[PDB]
Amino acid sequence: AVPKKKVSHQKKRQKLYGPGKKQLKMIHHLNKCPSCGHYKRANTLCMYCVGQISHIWKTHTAKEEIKPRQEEELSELDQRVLYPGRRDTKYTKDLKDKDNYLERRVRTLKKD
Amino acid sequence: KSRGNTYQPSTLKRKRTFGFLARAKSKQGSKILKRRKLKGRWFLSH
Amino acid sequence: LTRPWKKYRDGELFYGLSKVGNKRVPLTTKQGNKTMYKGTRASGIGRHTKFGGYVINWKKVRTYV
Amino acid sequence: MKVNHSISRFRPASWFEKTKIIPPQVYIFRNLEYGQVLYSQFPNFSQTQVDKLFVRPNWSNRKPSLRRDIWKCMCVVNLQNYKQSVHLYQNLCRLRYLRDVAQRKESDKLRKKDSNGHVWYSGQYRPTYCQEAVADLRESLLKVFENAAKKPSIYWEDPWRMGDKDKHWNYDVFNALGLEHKLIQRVGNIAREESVILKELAKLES
Amino acid sequence: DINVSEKIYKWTKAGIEQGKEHFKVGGNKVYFPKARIILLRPNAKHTPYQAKFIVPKSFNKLDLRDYLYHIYGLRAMNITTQLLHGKFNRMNLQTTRFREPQIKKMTIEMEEPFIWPEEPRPDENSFWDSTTPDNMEKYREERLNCLGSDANKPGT
Amino acid sequence: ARTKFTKPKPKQPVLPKDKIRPPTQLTHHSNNLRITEPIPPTTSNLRCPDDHPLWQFFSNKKFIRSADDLPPSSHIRPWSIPELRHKSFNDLHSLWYNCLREQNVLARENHLL
Amino acid sequence: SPGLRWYRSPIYPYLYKGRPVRALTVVRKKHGGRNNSGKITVRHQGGGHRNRTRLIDFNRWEGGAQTVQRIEYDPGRSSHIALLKHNTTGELSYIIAC
Amino acid sequence: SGSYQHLSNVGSRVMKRLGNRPKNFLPHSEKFIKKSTPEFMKSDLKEVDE
RNA sequence: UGCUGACAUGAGUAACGAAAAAAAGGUAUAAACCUUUUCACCUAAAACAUAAGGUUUAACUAUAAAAGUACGGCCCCUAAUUAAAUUAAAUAUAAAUAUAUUUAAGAUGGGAUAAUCUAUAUUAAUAUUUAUCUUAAAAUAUAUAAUUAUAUUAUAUAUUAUAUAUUUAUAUAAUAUAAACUAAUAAAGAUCAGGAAAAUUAAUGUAUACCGUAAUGUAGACCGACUCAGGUAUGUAAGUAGAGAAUAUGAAGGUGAAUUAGAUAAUUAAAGGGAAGGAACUCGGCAAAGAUAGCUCAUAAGUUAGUCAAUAAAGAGUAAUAAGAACAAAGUUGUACAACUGUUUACU
RNA sequence: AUAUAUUUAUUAAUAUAUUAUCUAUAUUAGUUUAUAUUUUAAUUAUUAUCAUAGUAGAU
Ligand SMILES: [Mg+2]
Ligand SMILES: [Mg+2]
Ligand SMILES: [Mg+2]
Ligand SMILES: [Mg+2]
Ligand SMILES: [Mg+2]
Ligand SMILES: [Mg+2]
Ligand SMILES: [Mg+2]
Ligand SMILES: [Mg+2]
Ligand SMILES: [Mg+2]
Ligand SMILES: [Mg+2]
Ligand SMILES: [Mg+2]
Ligand SMILES: [Mg+2]
Ligand SMILES: [Mg+2]
Ligand SMILES: [Mg+2]
Ligand SMILES: [Mg+2]
Ligand SMILES: [Mg+2]
Ligand SMILES: [Mg+2]
Ligand SMILES: [Mg+2]
Ligand SMILES: [Mg+2]
Ligand SMILES: [Mg+2]
Ligand SMILES: [Mg+2]
Ligand SMILES: [Mg+2]
Ligand SMILES: [Mg+2]
Ligand SMILES: [Mg+2]
Ligand SMILES: [Mg+2]
Ligand SMILES: [Mg+2]
Ligand SMILES: [Mg+2]
Ligand SMILES: [Mg+2]
Ligand SMILES: [Mg+2]
Ligand SMILES: [Mg+2]
Ligand SMILES: [Mg+2]
Ligand SMILES: [Mg+2]
Ligand SMILES: [Mg+2]
Ligand SMILES: [Mg+2]
Ligand SMILES: [Mg+2]
Ligand SMILES: [Mg+2]
Ligand SMILES: [Mg+2]
Ligand SMILES: [Zn+2]
Known part of the structure; x- marks a missing residue:
């Protein structure tokens, strides 16, 4: 149930790193994407090219934003009177800074 | 019967028992207050 | 998640920084029971009625001349 | 005892003619807390009226409190006949129903949304x-x-509460009628002596 | 002859007609008042015919009305009072906690409307320009809360 | 509880066609009603006066006095007690109220800042 | 019920089946057998039914003929009490019933 | 800020304690201030008491 | 089993706390945030109103709007009770103090008026607990005033038509569902016999103070060291079903979560089914299994006479015959001990 | 009912597409249901969810 001794430096290290099962393997199965000449996984789509195509689809197949007439044709002063500004909470501010906590996809290296 | 929740707050009761004025009014409470003052306490009572 | 930037369990609270603190700090108008009335030195103006109403006494009302 | 007052039921034209408490008119009430509106046949109202209007409440359109201070008269609309006023009142109730229950999606689409797609608010006040x-x-x-x-x-x-006298409120029918857009006289506490003011208005057109 | 509310309304109307106070003036004559009031910007829930003030915590509704009449010449017809809560604050967790001040805010209704002047641009006014102090605050946060290898991490 | 053995209840006793009263209200809401877009209230209907007494809380109708709009520190001095001592009561009272007004203007601005 | 099995109480049909005169009744303050210390001095006394003590005349001073109007149940004594009415005076009073 | 502290004198004792820091822990107090301030703001000379 | 600090080991191991998710888009930044649609879960709640509590957590600083009527406090009044208070000498007492009496405080309670809206000030003058039956009345049908069977039976409002003051008032007549529920009324059964305390006319008044109001509240926002399957007061709690607040469903509302994706060995947990046998198991039928109406009938020995035994066991009617939702309902007996309903070692 | 087309002399008739089957008032306070009035406010085929895999018979 309980360790009888302080496990030594040797014995913890040979346990962890000695076996190949536990080690990380080289990703030999990279290959060139045909659409953009960059690294991608074998039997896998290029995340750049499919992302680009998804973006294209979004730009074309776009549901139009609903802008109400009455709010679109308000005067500036009138709009200010109706819908004044406010102090956002700390939480709200944190939520707004998305680049702090949201990871954009990185581009791979160009294949040789 | 699970224990641990022996504190059951109720502001009124707290102020009656452990409030400053209750301490002031009793002789014993006044002595306590004095003792706390001597010690240097920032908060003498609830 | 309570907040999406904190995915894992840091020792951060649901709200604020610390739950604990000095309980012995003077009461305000907001705190206490329904019966707890603090007041704000605003109205020694008139007189409370027998029935629970109030009757202003204008000789004891502040004008700013 | 007598349980029901004038307010306790819906009153048709015939009832009004029999009584004549007020002239032919409909009262409209802003909610200072939430910005919601409350129509009524009388210058007072009860929980029954609130229940009738606020039938499908949610977080956005909460069923309002009946506390008298937050309710304030937006608009008092007078008409040519009691029957006409009753019909107007019914129409308003119908429209409210449509907005809340039947044709709710269309109404939502029509409204102003903020970022994060909610109907624009400041606190729980929605304008x-x-x-x-x-x-x-x-x-x-x-x-x-x-x-x-x-x-x-x-x-x-x-x-100020008019959208614009040019863009709206200038239909041919209204003009033919002679729809006079007057305002209530504010020479007194409008909120506190509201009922008195309403009575005075009622007296004026009779 | 007539009811109380109606009488009050009549009195108010008479006072308005006079150009005298639209309300019964008190007897406790304060010659040299030290109270200041902060005219606030209007919220969405208010109209152009309303104005809200931060006032003294010991300021009465009647007192406020009197102040508005005599100091400024404005007649507030209806007045409400909103005493705010005092949330706990502390400089750091090593310090003692205490409440922020309960602050009294009184809305008034007035017979003529009012809309504030439009707030200035960043380039125009020196003081009303939140970029600098906010940036400074951010920099302070970065520097105090920077620990190890985030010292090398470039500044925002 | 409901069971295999539960026989259904009888239908409610309807009042006959002749005996039922005609309802007091006959003609209800218009079926033609339509959800029109909202009509947002406009400043154009207002006539905010140029001498509204709430402008007295501002200074030259400015949301905020800039550094140039403010009176400079070298040019300005507070009153000396001796100077005050030979002023009349009414004058002193007026001065006090002017001071208070100025504070209010600054207090509004200071708070905003 | 097995609790009913040994419940005997004497029936008095002549006994009054109404409330006592309210002017002659004071509240019967409960103690739980606790003295001014707040400590239980007398054991085995506690939360009964609510009661009113009845002011019954033991001295019997006034004199003159008085008619017994009714005979009542009294919760604070084993005896019945008799509501007397003074024939001349008309003053009302309680008395231990014979 | 979103403070409201400036319209009152709340937590007065605490403020006094902070304001009147002991002089032998003045380097401690100012070390972190120096760190906080940018190069163009900070000065080398000692901020003497009133 | 020294004290304090720092850092190891177990170990990148267990665990990430009852849980239903999917796609598209915000965004070529999202398992976790927002929106839309789909799907699910709670639904006499995981809903909607509130009480208490609390680092304001809120839809936020441009912040929770009250003269009063199905608005609370404050105020008046007092209960339980409390009081360095109160009375040459109230009484007692090593001091502290204690007692009795006064006065003052003290809500968990009582408190005038009100939409046909309402006016609270000043001065003067003399109600434990339970029940709404039977009878009687008239009404509706069958038979030949009287019988039989069936509901109805005190109050709550609009309409119409009359008679009196003069379209506003008063009274009368007639018209008009069922089932729950409310308040107010009346009469009244039982012993366990049911709070306390604070006047009326007239004249003159009344410019209506202060505080509470967010959100959370069977909970991530309180008490449990934690965003803890624990503890936490009250009122509404769509319909369909039913004796019902049981049980099923779920209109609306709210929610689908600081862990995910896969795989589903051994093994564990919590479930479902099982041939032939049927307690052979085991200390012991522990556990599991077992309900051939729940309504209406009927129901023994014994016995303290109490359908106590009884919700008797078996059994009948209605329903169903191959079965085909949930929930209520789980035998009979002998002996020892204790009359019985209760109480007990909060955590063996 | 709206929108888009075709015929007809904006109207009516036809075709296609989309949305809808609500609502309000009476029956003495409230709630539900019922009927009447009001309104365009529908009844057949086939699915799904939930109730221990809802239960049961096979597999
Ligand atoms: Mg503890
Ligand atoms: Mg105690
Ligand atoms: Mg603690
Ligand atoms: Mg509170
Ligand atoms: Mg009040
Ligand atoms: Mg009012
Ligand atoms: Mg208030
Ligand atoms: Mg004994
Ligand atoms: Mg050692
Ligand atoms: Mg291991
Ligand atoms: Mg393992
Ligand atoms: Mg694991
Ligand atoms: Mg995405
Ligand atoms: Mg249930
Ligand atoms: Mg809630
Ligand atoms: Mg008192
Ligand atoms: Mg109370
Ligand atoms: Mg609240
Ligand atoms: Mg609320
Ligand atoms: Mg806590
Ligand atoms: Mg614990
Ligand atoms: Mg919990
Ligand atoms: Mg239900
Ligand atoms: Mg649903
Ligand atoms: Mg919720
Ligand atoms: Mg979880
Ligand atoms: Mg088997
Ligand atoms: Mg078998
Ligand atoms: Mg064996
Ligand atoms: Mg068993
Ligand atoms: Mg027998
Ligand atoms: Mg069972
Ligand atoms: Mg026993
Ligand atoms: Mg135990
Ligand atoms: Mg009814
Ligand atoms: Mg239809
Ligand atoms: Mg379900
Ligand atoms: Zn590519």
Whole structure:
């Protein structure tokens, strides 16, 4: 149930790193994407090219934003009177800074 | 019967028992207050 | 998640920084029971009625001349 | 004892004619807390009226409190006949129902949304409901006059509350009628002596 | 002859007609008042015919009305009072906690409307320009809360 | 509880066609009613006066006095007690109220800042 | 019920089946057998039914003929009490019933 | 800020304690201030008491 | 089993706390945030109103709006009770103090008026607990005033038509569902016999103070060291079903979560089914299994006479015959001990 | 009912597409249901969810 001794430096290290099962393997199965000449996984789509195509689809197949007439044709002063500004909470501010906590996809290296 | 929740707050009761004025009014409470003052306490009572 | 930037369990609270603190700090108008009335030195103006109403006494009302 | 008052039921034209408490008119009430509007046949109202209007409440359109201070008269609309006023009141109730239950999605689409796709608010005050009520009032009145002497009139709390006298409120039917957009006299505590003011208005057109 | 509310309304109307106070003036004559009031910007829930003030915590509704009449010449017809809560604050967790001040805010209704002047641009006014102090605050946060290898991490 | 053995209840006793009263209200809401877009209240209907007494809380109708709009520190001095001592009561009272007014203007601005 | 099995109480049909005169009744303050210390001095006394003590005349001073109007149940004594009415005076009073 | 502290004198004792820091822990107090301030703001000379 | 600090080991191991998710888009930044649609879960709640509590957590600083009527406090009044208070000498007492009496405080309670809206000030003058039956009345049908069977039976409002003051008032007549529920009324059964305390006319008044109001509240926002399957007061709690607040469903509302994706060995947990046998198991039928109406009938020995035994066991009617939702309902007996309903070692 | 087309002399008739089957008032306070009035406010085929895999018979 309980360790009888302080496990030594040797014995913890040979346990962890000695076996190949536990080690990380080289990703030999990279290959060139045909659409953009960059690294991608074998039997896998290029995340750049499919992302680009998804973006294209979004730009074309776009549901139009609903802008109400009455709010679109308000005067500036009138709009200010109706819908004044406010102090956002700390939480709200944190939520707004998305680049702090949201990871954009990185581009791979160009294949040789 | 699970224990641990022996504190059951109720502001009124707290102020009656452990409030400053209750301490002031009793002789014993006044002595306590004095003792706390001597010690240097920032908060003498609830 | 309570907040999406904190995915894992840091020792951060649901709200604020610390739950604990000095309980012995003077009461305000907001705190206490329904019966707890603090007041704000605003109205020694008139007189409370027998029935629970109030009757202003204008000789004891502040004008700013 | 006598349980029911004038307010306790819906009152048709015949009842009004029999009694004559007030002239032919409909009262409209802003909610200072949430911005919601409350129509009524009388210058007072009860929980029953609130229940009737606020039938499908949610977080956005919460069922309002009946506390007297937050309710304030937006608009007092007078008409040519008791029957006409009753019909207007019914139309308003119908419109409200449509907005809440039947044709809710269309109403939502029409409204102003903020970022994160909610109907624009400041606190729990939502300024769209009032606007809708003004638009709904305009619609109901128009319908009444299509269906169809004293010149009718709409005594406003505030002249600002009109969308625009050019863009709206200048239909041909209204003009033919002589729809006078007056405002309530603010020479006194408008909130506190509201009932008195309403009584005075009622007296004026009789 | 007539009811109380109606009488009050009549009195108010008479006072308005006079150009005298639209309300019964008190007897406790304060010649040299030290109270200041902060005219606030209007919220969405208010109209152009309303104005809200931060006032003294010991300021009465009647007192406020009197102040508005005599100091400024404005007649507030209806007045409400909103005493705010005092949330707990502390400089750091090593310090003692205490409440922020309960602050009294009184809305008034007035017979003529009012809309504030439009707030200035960043380039125009020196003081009303939140970029600098906010940036400074951010920099302070970075520097105090920077620990190890985030010292090398470039500044925002 | 409901069971295999539960026989259904009888239908409610309807009042006959002749005996039922005609309802007091006959003609209800218009079926033609339509959800129109809202009509947002406009400043154009207002006539905010140029001498509204609430402008007295501002200074030259400015949301905020800039550094140039403010009176500079070298040019300005507070009153000396001796100077005050030979002023009349009414004058002193007026001065006090002017001071208070100025504070209010600054207090509004200071708070905003 | 097995609790009913041994419940005997004497039936008095002549006994009054109404409330006592309210002017002659004071509240019967409960103690739980606790003295001014707040400590249980007398054991085995506690939360009974609510009661009113009845002011019954033991001294019997006034004199003159008095008619017994009714005979009542009294919760604070084993005896019945008799509501007397003074024939001349008309003053009302309680007395231990014979 | 979103403070409201400036319209009152709340937590007065605490403020006094902070304001009147002991002089032998003045380097401690100012070390972190120096760190906080940018190069163009900070000065080398000692901020003397009133 | 020294004290304090720092850092190891177990170990990148267990665990990430009852849980239903999917796609598209915000965004070529999202398992976790927002929106839309789909799907699910709670639904006499995981809903909607509130009480208490609390680092304001809120839809936020441009912040929770009250003269009063199905608005609370404050105020008046007092209960339980409390009081360095109160009375040459109230009484007692090593001091502290204690007692009795006064006065003052003290809500968990009582408190005038009100939409046909309402006016609270000043001065003067003399109600434990339970029940709404039977009878009687008239009404509706069958038979030949009287019988039989069936509901109805005190109050709550609009309409119409009359008679009196003069379209506003008063009274009368007639018209008009069922089932729950409310308040107010009346009469009244039982012993366990049911709070306390604070006047009326007239004249003159009344410019209506202060505080509470967010959100959370069977909970991530309180008490449990934690965003803890624990503890936490009250009122509404769509319909369909039913004796019902049981049980099923779920209109609306709210929610689908600081862990995910896969795989589903051994093994564990919590479930479902099982041939032939049927307690052979085991200390012991522990556990599991077992309900051939729940309504209406009927129901023994014994016995303290109490359908106590009884919700008797078996059994009948209605329903169903191959079965085909949930929930209520789980035998009979002998002996020892204790009359019985209760109480007990909060955590063996 | 709206929108888009075709015929007809904006109207009516036809075709296609989309949305809808609500609502309000009476029956003495409230709630539900019922009927009447009001309104355009529908009844057949086939699915799904939930109730221990809802239960049961096979597999
Ligand atoms: Mg503890
Ligand atoms: Mg105690
Ligand atoms: Mg603690
Ligand atoms: Mg509170
Ligand atoms: Mg009040
Ligand atoms: Mg009012
Ligand atoms: Mg208030
Ligand atoms: Mg004994
Ligand atoms: Mg050692
Ligand atoms: Mg291991
Ligand atoms: Mg393992
Ligand atoms: Mg694991
Ligand atoms: Mg995405
Ligand atoms: Mg249930
Ligand atoms: Mg809630
Ligand atoms: Mg008292
Ligand atoms: Mg109370
Ligand atoms: Mg609250
Ligand atoms: Mg609320
Ligand atoms: Mg806590
Ligand atoms: Mg614990
Ligand atoms: Mg919990
Ligand atoms: Mg139900
Ligand atoms: Mg649903
Ligand atoms: Mg919730
Ligand atoms: Mg979880
Ligand atoms: Mg088997
Ligand atoms: Mg078998
Ligand atoms: Mg064996
Ligand atoms: Mg068993
Ligand atoms: Mg027998
Ligand atoms: Mg069972
Ligand atoms: Mg026993
Ligand atoms: Mg135990
Ligand atoms: Mg009814
Ligand atoms: Mg239809
Ligand atoms: Mg379900
Ligand atoms: Zn590519």
